[PDB]
């Protein structure tokens, strides 16, 4: 099936997922000089105080922290969004080396990793209905810049040893995802897609300008995960990122003035 290797990686996803070459694919490069301020955007509201984390798991592509999304315990509203978007999971993308790893780029520059907090529009009742709609999902993208250790990531790093191979999971309760947000919520937004197959064009992307920190040591712990399942051959989980795709007939809008 699909992955990030030379034969099954992003350059070949279009064979089985022809939307890979569609009008609204992600990620993209963000040109800070040409992304224009949009005064119609409303203030972005992140409400995570009651978020309920459940489990952390290795799905053979990344690791996901899963949240209870049966109620409005953790929601995103405002900004470019109409309505209420519920948090279902977050996950990361990272590189084999600190100089690469992010999916979005900023003025063609890559960060060491990128965090995605995935939310779905409650007017569709269920995540599975939402992903079929152009306004179905909102993903909050946060860059990780190597520097000082990040205390808000350490609880994640501390459990990765328990989920080294595909299919493993662990209890992961009482994690506060507010600890992964920067202090400024200044952002860029554009309409796009999931960055993994099935690459559905159902996402309102909200990419924060301010990165969060991660130590070189913390990101090296991401790289100790494996793509493979136990009893299968070893494939270190590195470089699980899709390269940037053409902007085509879209506009990237800024929440803030240059
Ligand atoms: Zn992602």
Ligand 1 centroid–CA 116 distance in Å is 5
The token duo for 256 is 């803030």
Query: Is 258 known to sit in a ligand binding site?
Result: no
Q: Is 61 a catalytic residue?
A: yes
CA distance 71 to 245: 35
Residue 19: CB atoms within 10 A of its CB come to 17
Question: By what technique were these coordinates determined?
Answer: X-ray
End-to-end CA distance of the chain: 43
Q: Is residue 142 a contact partner of residue 118, using CB atoms and an 8 Å limit?
A: no
Domain edges within the chain: 1-258
CA distance 145 to 166: 27
Residue 55 pairs in a beta bridge with 66, 171
Q: Is residue 159 a contact partner of residue 153, using CB atoms and an 8 Å limit?
A: no
Query: Which DSSP string corresponds to the chain?
Result: ---SSTTTSGGGHHHH-GGGGSSS-S--EE-TTTPEE-TTPPPEEEE-TT--EEEEEE-SSSEEEEE--SSSSSEEEETT--S-EEEEEEEEEE-SSTT---SSEETTBPPSEEEEEEEEEGGGSSHHHHTTSTTSEEEEEEEEEESS--HHHHHHHHHGGG--SBT-EEE--S--GGGGS-S---EEEEEE--SSTT--S-EEEEEESSPEEE-HHHHHHHTTSBSSBTTS---B-----PPP----S---EESS--
Q: How many CA atoms lie within 13 A of 28 on its CB side?
A: 27
Query: Which DSSP string corresponds to 79-98?
Result: TT--S-EEEEEEEEEE-SST
Ligand 1 centroid–CA 104 distance in Å is 10
CA distance 247 to 31: 11
Strand, helix or coil for residue 156 = helix
Residue 166: CB atoms within 10 A of its CB come to 19
Which of these, 150, 140, 139, lies nearest to 221 by C-alpha position?
150
Ligand 1 centroid–CA 140 distance in Å is 10
Ligand 1 centroid–CA 26 distance in Å is 10
Tokens 């290797």, located at residue: 5
Query: Is 116 known to sit in a ligand binding site?
Result: yes
Q: What is the dihedral of CA 238, 53, 174, 185, to 10 degrees?
A: 70
CA distance 86 to 75: 5
Residue 114 pairs in a beta bridge with 93, 143
Pairing of strands 212-214, 53-58: unpaired
Which of these, 117, 65, 116, 60, lies nearest to 93 by C-alpha position?
116
Residues near ion ligand 1 (CB < 5 Å) are: 116
Geometric angle at alpha carbon 94, from 7 and 166, rounded to 5°: 65
Residue 5: CB atoms within 10 A of its CB come to 12
CA distance 132 to 125: 12
Strand, helix or coil for residue 231 = coil
Residue 109 pairs in a beta bridge with 106
- For 176-218, give the secondary structure using H, E and C: CHHHHCCCCCCEEEEEECCCCCCCCCCEEEEEECCCEEECHHH
Ligand 1 centroid–CA 71 distance in Å is 23
Ligand 1 centroid–CA 87 distance in Å is 14
Q: Which residues, including other chains, have CB under 8 Å from residue 46's CB and lie 6 or more apart? A: 76, 140, 178, 181, 185
The token duo for 24 is 């609204």
Q: What are the CA-CA distances from residue 71 to residues 35, 50, 125, 129 (Å)?
A: 35, 10, 11, 16
The token duo for 34 is 């040409």
CA distance 92 to 113: 7
CA distance 255 to 233: 46
Residue 229 DSSP symbol:
B
Ligand 1 centroid–CA 196 distance in Å is 7
Query: Is 1 known to sit in a ligand binding site?
Result: no
Which residue out of 1, 12, 33, 61 is catalytically annotated? 61
CA distance 119 to 44: 14
Residue 93 pairs in a beta bridge with 114
């Amino acid at each position: 099936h699909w992955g990030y290797g030379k034969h099954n990686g992003p350059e070949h996803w279009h064979k089985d997922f022809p939307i890979a070459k569609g009008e609204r694919q992600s990620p993209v490069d963000i040109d800070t000089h040409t992304a224009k301020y949009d005064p119609s955007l409303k203030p972005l509201s992140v409400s995570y105080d009651q978020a309920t984390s459940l489990r952390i798991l290795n799905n053979g592509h990344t690791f996901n922290v899963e949240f209870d999304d049966s109620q409005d315990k953790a929601v995103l509203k405002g900004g470019p969004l109409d309505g209420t978007y519920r948090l279902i999971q977050f996950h990361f993308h990272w590189g084999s080396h600190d100089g690469q790893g992010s999916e979005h780029t900023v003025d063609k520059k890559k960060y060491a990793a990128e965090l995605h907090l995935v939310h779905w529009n409650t007017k569709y009742g269920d995540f599975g209905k939402a992903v079929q709609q152009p306004d179905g999902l909102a993903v909050l993208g946060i860059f990780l810049k190597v520097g000082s250790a990040n205390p808000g990531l350490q609880k994640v790093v501390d459990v990765l040893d328990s989920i080294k191979t595909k299919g493993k999971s662990a209890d992961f309760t009482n994690f506060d995802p507010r600890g992964l947000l920067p202090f400024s919520l200044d952002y860029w937004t554009y309409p796009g897609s999931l960055t993994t197959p099935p690459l559905l064009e159902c996402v309102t992307w909200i990419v924060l300008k301010e990165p969060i920190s991660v130590s070189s040591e913390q990101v090296s712990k991401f790289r100790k995960l494996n793509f493979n399942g136990e009893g299968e051959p070893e494939e270190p989980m590195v470089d699980n990122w899709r390269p940037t795709q053409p902007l085509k007939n879209r506009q990237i809008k800024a929440s803030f003035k240059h």
